[PDB]
Write a protein that binds this ligand. Structure first.
Ligand SMILES: CCCCC[C@H](CC(=O)NO)C(=O)N[C@H](C(=O)N1CCC[C@H]1CO)C(C)C
Ligand SMILES: [Fe+2]
Length: 161
């Protein structure tokens, strides 16, 4: 549909807590989802959250072990301790950088698609990492807030030439 501007870290809209979607299968919600996919694809992103395009709603999309192409609305996550994994992340809202972030190796997630149909899955590894990363956007968190080792945070061009 249309490519929307991705907000950058420092924008206070990225720090807010997103509100739930109350009505499903509306033209307005279908446009949002279409806008998010075009904006995501345009950036070669593996996920996107509505607050990143300035829409303060609990909507995430992802899909790039194939990660299934998914619209997840009003997500509920369950973290599965104690197995954590470190890995490199970047964010379309933190352009130019990468940092190592510890994530749960496995999570459960549920919610609804844009039609209101239920979604309910257990995810592992990169799939689970993407879901955690996008969920964080809905609660005001960007991945530098999760970093504990800032010697492993820097510019992509320097870390991975
Ligand atoms: C990895 C967990 C985060 C996934 C989502 C982000 C996109 C984003 O900002 N979503 O909110 C992404 O695709 N990031 C990519 C990313 O971090 N990648 C791409 C695959 C490997 C990894 C970098 O090591 C690039 C495009 C910056
Ligand atoms: Fe992000």
């Amino acid at each position: 549909h249309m490519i929307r501007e991705i907000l950058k870290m420092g924008d206070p809209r990225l720090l807010e807590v997103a509100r739930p979607v109350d009505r499903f299968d509306t033209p307005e919600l279908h446009e949002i989802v279409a806008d998010m996919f075009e904006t995501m694809h345009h950036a070669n992103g593996a996920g996107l959250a509505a607050p990143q395009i300035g829409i303060g709603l609990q909507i995430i999309i992802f899909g790039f072990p194939p990660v299934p192409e998914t619209v997840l609305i009003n997500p509920k996550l369950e973290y599965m301790p104690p197995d954590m994994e470190e890995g490199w992340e970047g964010c379309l809202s933190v352009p130019g950088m990468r940092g190592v972030v510890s994530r749960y190796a496995k999570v459960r997630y549920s919610g609804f698609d844009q039609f209101g149909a239920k979604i309910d899955r257990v995810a592992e590894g990169f799939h689970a990492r993407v879901v955690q990363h996008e969920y964080d956007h809905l609660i005001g968190k960007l991945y530098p807030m999760r970093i504990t080792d800032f010697t492993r945070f820097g510019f992509t061009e320097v870390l991975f030439p």
